[PDB]
Design an enzyme around this catalytic site. Structure first.
Site, short mmCIF file in Angstrom:
data_model
loop_
_atom_site.label_atom_id
_atom_site.label_comp_id
_atom_site.label_asym_id
_atom_site.label_seq_id
_atom_site.Cartn_x
_atom_site.Cartn_y
_atom_site.Cartn_z
CB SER B 592 36.75 41.72 34.64
OG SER B 592 37.86 40.59 34.99
CG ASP B 670 40.14 40.96 42.40
OD1 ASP B 670 40.33 39.87 41.93
OD2 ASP B 670 39.63 41.81 41.83
CG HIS B 702 37.42 39.69 39.71
ND1 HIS B 702 38.12 40.66 39.53
CD2 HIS B 702 36.61 39.27 38.68
CE1 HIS B 702 37.84 40.72 38.08
NE2 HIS B 702 37.15 39.92 37.53
#
Ligand SMILES: *[C@@H]1O[C@H](CO)[C@@H](O[C@H]2O[C@H](CO)[C@@H](O[C@@H]3O[C@H](CO)[C@@H](O)[C@H](O)[C@@H]3O)[C@H](O)[C@H]2NC(C)=O)[C@H](O)[C@H]1NC(C)=O
Ligand SMILES: *[C@@H]1O[C@H](CO)[C@@H](O[C@H]2O[C@H](CO)[C@@H](O[C@H]3O[C@H](CO)[C@@H](O)[C@H](O)[C@@H]3O)[C@H](O)[C@H]2NC(C)=O)[C@H](O)[C@H]1NC(C)=O
Ligand SMILES: *[C@H]1O[C@H](CO)[C@@H](O[C@@H]2O[C@H](CO)[C@@H](O[C@@H]3O[C@H](CO)[C@@H](O)[C@H](O)[C@@H]3O)[C@H](O)[C@H]2NC(C)=O)[C@H](O)[C@H]1NC(C)=O
Ligand SMILES: *[C@@H]1O[C@H](CO[C@@H]2O[C@@H](C)[C@@H](O)[C@@H](O)[C@@H]2O)[C@@H](O[C@@H]2O[C@H](CO)[C@@H](O)[C@H](O)[C@H]2NC(C)=O)[C@H](O)[C@H]1NC(C)=O
Ligand SMILES: *[C@@H]1O[C@H](CO[C@@H]2O[C@@H](C)[C@@H](O)[C@@H](O)[C@@H]2O)[C@@H](O[C@@H]2O[C@H](CO)[C@@H](O)[C@H](O)[C@H]2NC(C)=O)[C@H](O)[C@H]1NC(C)=O
Ligand SMILES: *[C@H]1O[C@H](CO[C@@H]2O[C@@H](C)[C@@H](O)[C@@H](O)[C@@H]2O)[C@@H](O[C@@H]2O[C@H](CO)[C@@H](O)[C@H](O)[C@H]2NC(C)=O)[C@H](O)[C@H]1NC(C)=O
Ligand SMILES: *[C@@H]1O[C@H](CO)[C@@H](O[C@@H]2O[C@H](CO)[C@@H](O)[C@H](O)[C@H]2NC(C)=O)[C@H](O)[C@H]1NC(C)=O
Ligand SMILES: *[C@@H]1O[C@H](CO)[C@@H](O[C@@H]2O[C@H](CO)[C@@H](O)[C@H](O)[C@H]2NC(C)=O)[C@H](O)[C@H]1NC(C)=O
Ligand SMILES: *[C@H]1O[C@H](CO)[C@@H](O[C@@H]2O[C@H](CO)[C@@H](O)[C@H](O)[C@H]2NC(C)=O)[C@H](O)[C@H]1NC(C)=O
Ligand SMILES: *[C@H]1O[C@H](CO)[C@@H](O[C@@H]2O[C@H](CO)[C@@H](O)[C@H](O)[C@H]2NC(C)=O)[C@H](O)[C@H]1NC(C)=O
Ligand SMILES: *[C@H]1O[C@H](CO)[C@@H](O[C@H]2O[C@H](CO)[C@@H](O)[C@H](O)[C@H]2NC(C)=O)[C@H](O)[C@H]1NC(C)=O
Ligand SMILES: *[C@@H]1O[C@H](CO)[C@@H](O)[C@H](O)[C@H]1NC(C)=O
Ligand SMILES: *[C@@H]1O[C@H](CO)[C@@H](O)[C@H](O)[C@H]1NC(C)=O
Ligand SMILES: *[C@@H]1O[C@H](CO)[C@@H](O)[C@H](O)[C@H]1NC(C)=O
Lengths: 728, 726
Positions: B592, B670, B702
């Site tokens: 991320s 995601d 994610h």
């Protein structure tokens, strides 16, 4: 000294094959565009003259993507704002330039985002499609006449095909056919109302904040197919009735009984048109020959003029029913069909007689009919030297079939064994295009005696450059398995030494009726691999391959993912037996169907292959389109062929991939073989914990043909292959 | 000398950390869930009883994945048919077991596909959300009271949050708050009507012929945000023949002037509720305090009684303005705010006084207020030994701020430097939860004299297993970046020899207010990398890090992708010169925000890193959600911060990737950092002719946390790392 053919050479297109693109405007002259000026040539003498000067359109405010002069040569259609869509389709803007007054037409212009435009075959009438509706323009500067009102995005298509019809049925976007003199305008209508949509994201330029979702009516194997209707309208009555009626030609009853397709439409005469229909179960095909009934205004198709063409061992035609070639008077025609020996040959039909008369030999096939005169019929076949991978132009005497001549076989036997041809409007002249095994050679000929008028292009420039490089050689040959011969080809590194053991890369496709072993000359990735990396790149046409008779082509009927797959494995074994192959460095790669086969082979357990690459592979047939898939697989239902559909997937072999290095590649914007197919392969490999390599290509489609993308994928694949073979 | 901590050990969870998840049901007891049942414990003595043996449902016909006991003790909510949605959200079926009669309630049961359920704070009232509308049952087996009728999928959310509110504001799917005694049901309403939808394909099981398309209202930087409304309904008034009435609490006018958010809801008393609103430009928030008015039936929020919290150096709060802790009479409250020096400390407020009084101070920060009694304020901070990465429970005497006592600092200094706590209802007892640097240790205490009652879980079993494996060590220290000091940690290989040169991997995140160098004990990928592959896995907290004051944290304000990436490189630069670090073999990876930073570093031309791995990275802020992105970047408009938005993308650095070995990984499903972000990174590298390694994970979000994918990605990354390091 003398360098090799490097990856950069390939990617930067350093050594270019010169072509000689020509466009016949009459029976004696043709147009030759020179990137700046478009001049017209006199076939007879070869003298030229500028037809349209280079700067004729500067200050146009737009780059001209293409030109299209009307038959009567009074107007020219300027195509710009081009925007590709699928394989053939695309959208663009258009302007018509009056040549009679060197004036650009600025009135009632063709709409921006027009889907398709076509001049009438005579005069200067126009027929175009906009917002899925057909419009006709009698005069370039006059208001158009709307023909259809049912046009509707992703639902109804008039004058253009939906996705499946473009790619698999018509191998063309257009769905309208002007009659020979331009009086009638025939077109088809496709209703994709009930057809499931394929949806995938399109990211576009960085500047797009939110990805776009592309949704295309696309029938997967077993899904609901689009339905079709055929119409014919008289464009000569448009300026008299306000809303000219489109006459519909339906049936045949034998076809209306269930799902079917319209696979071909060709006008025989000014008032006669033939329509070929095909059942969803593509083993039955029917041709209707309909005449305009001046009394009823309707179109009648006598059943006595209806010709049935079916197949007991497979499907009809190579990819679809053969196209008909009518004699001038429209009372008889020639069509390629497979004889009793399963070989494809030309047979003569009389429109009201069901039995046709074959006019060609045996153990070889006619590739296509190229021209028809009152005297001879010109066609291409692979008869010469009994080489299924060779191509030549022949001509048979219509009055005596025993009299057949080859116009190309002997022009230059060492350099030319693969020919394509382009005749003038009336076959008075014709250009011969040789594509191998030597450098492309283009020549012009007069049909009277087939005298060679002159050489249009011999690629002498290229030839000089290549002598300065250690180019690879090509071996084309055959092997005999189960007493049947099977052709293959190998691209050998310079200074090939049968004593040494070379790493071999098996380049595969192996789809139904495919041919990877031929006499064509090519400058591609394989050229670099052999030349620079000293790697042997081989191809093998096994069962299911084409141009060798139905016995071989129909070998995989209803059995995709079997023999075709086994034969590629056997081929590697056979090549190894030849003694110059390293058992420890045998790779395999393919694209599309080649990807499917590569994958099936890699996960076969046949420890022959070390590594492999699959590009845009089909993973399970239920994911591919209906027309193509069902042609060879039938329906994915339990009463039909569902079992084999499920047994022939790539995912079902995931576990076997633990013993090989795999590289999966696919464009995210692939509208043909959906990204979904690889998505399920990676997921299956993940579920059984098998490591592999991957690479997605953002926004690239089935061709992954963007300049940068093209260079990136081959650069990436080279690394993989080099590493797998412990090179350099 | 014994085996090492292997990849399989990690992926298979061979050495599992034991926990002690208790749930306080009163000021004296707590429930302790197990594998086959639930027990009730007596905090005072430690004796317990069986509340139910689960075997009560051996034939329930469904596999229960969660139980929820009414605070009453009379009912058990049984949650099954679980279906995960986003981070906190999900849907599920529910049944209620009446403990009084030991029988399943058969009538008026909760609708299948319920989005949220919650017992009231005291009796056995239920409030649940179904099809975006709120429902209240006063008795478990009684008909429900339809509170709202405007709910509509993807458009109007009543009682639950939309994607961005769940993820960036409330960190919860719930949007309803019962009053302390269960009389009032407060709830928020979200209108996403004009919010653009992110769309992506979901492939599902092989059997699915056509890919399906997921579409979800999600505001990217500068897009149209969902709007919000707040309501309060008296659950003791709802009729049955009349539609429930919901009183709305609007404004502040200083908020209605433009885009804003409801960022906090905290009841103060049975009739006083507080609300915090934040302007879209997150540097100005306002707290309203509203009391119920029986005569008018409305809720009044007297101006002058509202409190403005603003920031001039950055945004308000670490991720949002803190929660207030109201005194018994709700006439005053304590809440963490940033003092004049930029450090977060506790400030004392009187509901109608403008300025508050800081009851703590210093160059350290209060992590959070854990409990409040008339006598004391219990809080957690990193004051001890001046270690920003450590956490200890303290208590400050409300009568004399000069008397602050650390309750955990000395329990076991060697083993424990990081605690979290769980107090009983009235703070009579509290459970300490040590999480490092040694093995997790759970203990129970009593507030009266802070006596260590007993040890709940000391992870002795695990400790015995680990002594038989060559575990790596952890060094927490710091470096001085001109004047200021910045902390870092290094997971060191067993038998580390400062004489030998080791390959180093920079584990990074570095998002705003992040902390990667702490005293927590972890059994992760890095453990394996150091234990088996003898790779030093470091982490550094530079400008942008949290828990060290606004000067550090707000340094990247309106400037993401700058100082935090540069400092990550400065750190690596200094680590390389250490001598026991092989400067030719230094890698970097992150997930991320870490993915973003890893990508930015790799494309910086530093030449410090040989290779790097970016998992589900952000590539350009205009692609990320509004609440998070805007908080630090402002709006992507030319009048504001569009320029820096454009200069801080990963794609702009494509050409620089030619000097390194890059691995890009991203889950196709995601919903957080859209696959779109990595698709744009690959496309830019291709356009510049940069070769790299890639790997997508179909249908993974994610977290790329499905069992098989989790194993696969780490297996893939390991090969990549050792290949780069050999
Ligand atoms: C030129 O002639 C066309 C041929 O009839 C005509 O086609 C359309 O005619 C109407 C008008 O849109 C369409 O709608 C029909 O409406 C009735 C009444 O509701 C329905 O019962 C019927 O089912 C249908 O919906 C027709 O569908 C359509 N017919 C065809 C074959 O296309 C064109 O509209 C006409 N153009 C102009 C400008 O008049
Ligand atoms: C959720 O939020 C919506 C606004 O984002 C509320 O709605 C209102 O806004 C729309 C415009 O966005 C107004 O106009 C609509 O109708 C006209 C004509 O039909 C259209 O031309 C226009 O494009 C819009 O579709 C509405 O007037 C307005 N609603 C009302 C009732 O006035 C919506 O009400 C709100 N829902 C809830 C429960 O709060
Ligand atoms: C192409 O195919 C679609 C079907 O896939 C055609 O749509 C169908 O059109 C008929 C019209 O006869 C619709 O029937 C009507 O339904 C309404 C109720 O909705 C009823 O009130 C009418 O009396 C009539 O029965 C039918 O619903 C509709 N089906 C679908 C799936 O939409 C479409 O018309 C065809 N398009 C063309 C131009 O050929
Ligand atoms: C190509 O050139 C011919 C000229 O032909 C000439 O005569 C032949 C016998 C032969 O010797 C050629 O090499 C000579 O160039 C052009 O023919 C003229 O065409 C017009 C109509 O367009 C006709 O009316 C004239 O009579 C023709 N001239 C002759 C001598 O017959 C022809 O147009 C040229 N085409 C181009 C594209 O340049
Ligand atoms: C936990 O234990 C208490 C009783 O423990 C005993 O009494 C204490 C006062 C102390 O002297 C200990 O050493 C003894 O072991 C239970 O208290 C009873 O609670 C029930 C209601 O739950 C009530 O009916 C009794 O009158 C209580 N008796 C006492 C002694 O107060 C308590 O219930 C036990 N809790 C659990 C979870 O088992
Ligand atoms: C929630 O659904 C369950 C299961 O019902 C099935 O699944 C649903 C998604 C829907 O597709 C239904 O049509 C299906 O029948 C309901 O539980 C009952 O389950 C039994 C079989 O175990 C079935 O015979 C019943 O018809 C189902 N419904 C009822 C009320 O009898 C459940 O009741 C649903 N929620 C509620 C509270 O009604
Ligand atoms: C409570 O309010 C709801 C919504 O306003 C009422 O339900 C609607 O009533 C109208 C009129 O009969 C219907 O057209 C709708 O379909 C109903 N449902 C919805 C969601 O709109 C309900 O009747 C009211 N109850 C009372 C007694 O006032
Ligand atoms: C809160 O943020 C706003 C917007 O970023 C600040 O207002 C802007 O401040 C800059 C000065 O650096 C000016 O150039 C702009 O014209 C101001 N207006 C806006 C809205 O763009 C405001 O100063 C900040 N408030 C605090 C307390 O710092
Ligand atoms: C080509 O189109 C038609 C094809 O039949 C030619 O014939 C005329 O067709 C119309 C039908 O619309 C009849 O009504 C006429 O009677 C036909 N003409 C004759 C000779 O009978 C037509 O002549 C040709 N048109 C052009 C422009 O060449
Ligand atoms: C919990 O809180 C509610 C509201 O504060 C209490 O209800 C109030 O009770 C008083 C009696 O002392 C009444 O005069 C008020 O009118 C009530 N307010 C409302 C709006 O209901 C409720 O009694 C409390 N619950 C308990 C059992 O203490
Ligand atoms: C073309 O192939 C199809 C295959 O479906 C044949 O269809 C039917 O007839 C076969 C024998 O006559 C049966 O074995 C098939 O089961 C049946 N099809 C179905 C779906 O049941 C068809 O006959 C073939 N056509 C010819 C002339 O060979
Ligand atoms: C096509 O689009 C251009 C640009 O929008 C416009 O100027 C032009 O007039 C359009 N032409 C037609 C045929 O609509
Ligand atoms: C014999 O069968 C085919 C030819 O008919 C050949 O390709 C194959 O290798 C041989 N054996 C098998 C079972 O495939
Ligand atoms: C001080 O340190 C910061 C970050 O540690 C660095 O960016 C800066 O260049 C140094 N000196 C000055 C004058 O800012």
């Amino acid at each position: 000294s003398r360098k090799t053919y490097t990856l950069t050479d390939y990617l930067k297109n350093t050594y270019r094959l010169k072509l000689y693109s020509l466009r016949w405007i009459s029976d004696h002259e043709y147009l030759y565009k020179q990137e700046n000026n478009i001049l017209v040539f006199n076939a007879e003498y070869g003298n030229s003259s500028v037809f349209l000067e280079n700067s004729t359109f500067d200050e146009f405010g737009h780059s001209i993507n293409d030109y299209s002069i009307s038959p009567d040569g009074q107007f020219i259609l300027l195509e710009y704002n081009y925007v590709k869509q699928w394989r053939h389709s695309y959208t663009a803007s258009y302007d018509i330039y009056d040549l009679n007054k060197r004036q650009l037409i600025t009135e009632e212009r063709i709409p921006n985002n027009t889907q398709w435009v076509t001049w009438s075959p005579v005069g200067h009438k126009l027929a175009y499609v906009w917002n899925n509706d057909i419009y006709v323009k009698i005069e370039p500067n006059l208001p158009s006449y709307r023909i259809t009102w049912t046009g509707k995005e992703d639902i109804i298509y008039n004058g253009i095909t939906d996705w499946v019809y473009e790619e698999e049925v018509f191998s063309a976007y257009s769905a309208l056919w002007w009659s020979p003199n331009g009086t009638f305008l025939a077109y088809a209508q496709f209703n994709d109302t009930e057809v499931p949509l394929i949806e995938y994201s399109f990211y576009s330029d960085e500047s797009l904040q939110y990805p776009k979702t592309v949704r295309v009516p696309y029938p997967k194997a077993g899904a609901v197919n689009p339905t079709v209707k055929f119409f014919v309208v008289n464009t000569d009555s448009l300026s008299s009735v306000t809303n000219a009626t489109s006459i519909q030609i339906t049936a045949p009853a034998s076809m209306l009984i269930g799902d079917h397709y319209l696979c071909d439409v060709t006008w025989a005469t000014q008032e006669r048109i033939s329509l070929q229909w095909l059942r969803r179960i593509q083993n039955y095909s029917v041709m209707d020959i309909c005449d305009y009934d001046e009394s009823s205004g309707r179109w009648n198709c006598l059943v006595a003029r209806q010709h049935i063409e079916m197949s007991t061992t497979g499907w009809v035609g190579r990819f679809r029913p053969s196209e008909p070639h009518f004699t001038l008077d429209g009372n008889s025609f020639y069509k390629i069909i497979s004889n009793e020996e399963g070989y494809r040959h030309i047979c003569y039909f009389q429109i009201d007689k069901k039995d046709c008369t074959f006019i060609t030999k045996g153990t070889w096939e006619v590739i296509g009919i190229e021209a028809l005169t009152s005297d001879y019929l010109y066609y291409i076949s692979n008869e010469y030297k009994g080489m299924p991978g060779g191509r030549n132009l022949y001509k048979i005497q219509l009055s005596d079939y025993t009299k057949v001549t080859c116009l190309s076989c002997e022009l230059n036997p060492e350099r030319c064994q693969y020919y394509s041809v382009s005749f003038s409007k009336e076959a008075k002249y014709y250009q011969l295009r040789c594509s191998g095994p030597g450098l492309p050679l283009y020549t012009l000929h007069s049909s009277v005696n087939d005298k060679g008028l002159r050489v249009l292009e011999d690629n002498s420039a290229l030839d000089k450059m290549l002598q300065n490089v250690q180019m690879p050689s090509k071996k084309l040959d055959f092997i005999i398995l189960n007493e049947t011969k099977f052709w293959y080809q190998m691209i050998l590194p310079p200074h090939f030494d049968k004593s040494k053991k070379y790493p071999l890369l098996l380049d595969v496709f192996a789809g139904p009726c495919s041919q990877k072993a031929d006499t064509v000359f090519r400058l591609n990735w394989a050229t670099y691999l052999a030349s620079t990396e000293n790697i042997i790149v081989a191809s093998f046409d096994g069962r299911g391959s084409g141009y060798q008779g139905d016995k071989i082509m129909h070998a995989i009927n209803r059995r995709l993912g079997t023999f075709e797959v086994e034969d590629q494995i056997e081929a590697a074994r056979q090549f190894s037996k030849m003694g110059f192959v390293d058992n420890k460095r045998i790779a395999i790669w393919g694209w599309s169907y080649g990807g499917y086969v590569t994958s099936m082979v890699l996960g076969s357990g046949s420890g022959v292959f070390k590594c492999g690459i699959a590009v845009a592979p089909v993973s399970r047939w239920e994911y591919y389109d209906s027309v193509y898939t069902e042609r060879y697989m039938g329906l994915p239902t339990p009463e039909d062929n569902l079992d084999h559909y499920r047994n022939s997937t790539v995912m079902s072999r995931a576990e076997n991939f633990k013993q090989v290095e795999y590289l999966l590649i696919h464009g995210t914007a692939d509208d043909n073989v959906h990204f979904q197919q690889s998505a399920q392969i990676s997921k299956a490999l993940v579920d059984v914990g098998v490591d592999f390599q991957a690479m997605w290509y953002t926004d690239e489609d089935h061709g992954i043909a963007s300049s940068t993308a093209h260079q990136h994928i081959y650069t990436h694949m080279s690394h993989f292959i080099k590493q797998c073979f412990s090179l350099p």
